[PDB]
């Protein structure tokens, strides 16, 4: 009850937006623009569908491309910590949660289960993918289907289903050669394809450059 009044009082403050922007990721120095974008990504928008004909989503996807050592994964860890419903997965392999739905006998409970991917589990939530370039064919296909149609179709073991995938996607990746090239476009620097990049609303580029003062401050922290 009083929490609602406190929320309204904080809203009455004229600089609440900057407070929220600076409130994200206390443990990461710099990258203020990334935090500002993640603010909008977390708060989100509003879907619109006039009748049952024209669906427009309100989820703001985020893509990060960075040189090694820029702490891309720490942002995803913080987002998972803060978000009420957030799923984390990695494309390199051996992930705790898969990225594709399948029907299997669970090793522990020994029961016949339908395990949907991380995309399905995060209904009205956030899905985080690390090592975005390392993903194989199946993961890329499932991600493309979930981002463009916002639904996942399953036809396996006599089961035919369609499941809702209303989720916000945040991803991190590294350039092709291991270092970003300012003389080439974003698409030429990244292993991903243009249709996949086109889905993301916000693209962030983190380029490592030798600044003595910034390096000194980062080392101090």
């Amino acid at each position: 009850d009083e929490d609602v009044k406190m929320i309204t009082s904080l809203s009455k403050d004229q600089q609440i937006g900057e407070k929220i922007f600076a409130s994200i990721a206390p443990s990461i120095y710099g990258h203020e623009d990334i935090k500002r974008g993640l603010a909008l990504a977390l708060f989100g928008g509003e879907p619109k569908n006039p009748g049952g004909k024209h669906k427009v989503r309100g989820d703001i996807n985020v893509l990060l491309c960075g040189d090694p050592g820029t702490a891309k994964s720490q942002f995803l860890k913080y987002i998972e910590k803060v978000s009420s419903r957030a799923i984390f997965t990695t494309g390199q392999g051996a992930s705790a949660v898969g990225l594709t739905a399948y029907v299997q006998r669970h090793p522990v409970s020994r029961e016949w289960t339908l395990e949907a991917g991380a995309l399905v589990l995060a209904d009205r939530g956030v899905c985080l993918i690390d090592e975005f370039d390392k993903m194989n064919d199946q993961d890329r296909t499932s991600i493309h289907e979930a981002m463009e149609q916002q639904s996942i179709s399953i036809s396996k073991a006599g089961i035919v289903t369609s499941l809702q995938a209303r989720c916000t996607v945040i991803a991190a990746a590294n350039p092709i050669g291991g270092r970003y090239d300012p003389s080439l476009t974003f698409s030429e620097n990244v292993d991903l394809t243009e249709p996949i990049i086109s889905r993301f609303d916000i693209l962030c580029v983190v380029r490592d450059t030798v600044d003595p003062v910034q390096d000194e401050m980062l080392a101090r922290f």
């Binding site: 036809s155 073991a157 006599g158 089961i159 035919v160």
Partner: protein, 267 residues
């Protein structure tokens, strides 16, 4: 068992009806030449159109489709009578002859997915593909034994699936004489008949997309042993019956349903 039956209106009338059905004297029927062909070819079963029977006698067709075993027994008795009538010499070779069925069954034309308990004990038609087959195995019908100690030979008769339910008194193989003199089995004089089991699955072209298939199990008797092979598309007409489980105290109440073929057709 000394129990015998003296009168039975239904069975006698049904036998008379089949006798009139298979006469073909005052009619354009062909079954007489069919029987002559069977005698010529040494085969011992007949195929009769169901639609023809319904046209000639609708009540008999209705009863046969609704009730199978007794009507089939009456058919076999009538075949024995007419084979004896035309040529009694040929009827000596075989114990009993058999009847096949053919024609458009209509509502009873049933897919392996749509076979239900509603069609139990009736004659059904099914279209499918063959997936599993088993080796041909002989089965004993009449056994003959000889006693070197007393120079006497005996014979025992077996009837297991002829009767619906069997008991431990039957199906016992004799090995000793009344005075414990050993008996020697003489395999030449005994009688055996072949036996096979196959499995039929609903064709993938007909099954609904994305759904698992359903299958039926079929038993092939002595005549129809080699008529089927795996990977083949066939149509089977036959009875649909329950399978008697072996003796026990507590039963869960679930039977096994097995289709006993009478006609197998390569479409």
């Amino acid at each position: 068992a000394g129990t015998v039956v003296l009168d039975d209106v239904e069975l006698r009338e049904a036998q008379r009806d089949y006798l009139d059905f298979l006469d073909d004297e005052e009619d354009q029927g062909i079954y007489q030449s069919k029987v002559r062909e069977l005698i010529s070819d040494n085969q011992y079963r007949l195929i009769v159109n169901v639609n023809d029977l319904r046209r000639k006698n609708e009540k008999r067709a209705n009863r046969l489709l609704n009730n199978a075993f007794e009507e089939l027994v009456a058919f076999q008795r009538a075949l024995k009578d007419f084979v004896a009538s035309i040529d009694a010499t040929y009827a000596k070779q075989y114990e009993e002859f058999y009847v096949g069925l053919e024609g458009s069954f209509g509502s009873k034309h049933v897919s392996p997915r749509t076979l239900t308990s509603c069609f139990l004990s009736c004659v059904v038609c099914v279209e499918g593909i063959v997936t599993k087959c088993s080796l041909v195995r002989p089965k004993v019908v009449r056994s003959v034994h000889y006693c070197p100690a007393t120079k006497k030979t005996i014979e025992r008769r077996y009837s297991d699936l002829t009767t619906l339910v069997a008991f431990p008194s039957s199906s016992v193989y004799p090995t000793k004489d009344e005075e414990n003199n050993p008996l020697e089995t003489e395999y030449g004089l005994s009688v055996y008949k072949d036996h096979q089991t196959i499995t039929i699955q609903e064709m993938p072209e007909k099954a609904p997309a994305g759904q698992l298939p359903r299958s039926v199990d079929v038993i092939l008797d002595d005549d129809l042993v080699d008529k089927a092979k795996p990977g083949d598309r066939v149509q089977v007409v036959g009875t649909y019956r329950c399978l008697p489980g072996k003796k026990g105290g507590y039963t869960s109440g679930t039977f096994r349903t097995v289709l006993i073929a009478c006609n197998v057709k390569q479409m």
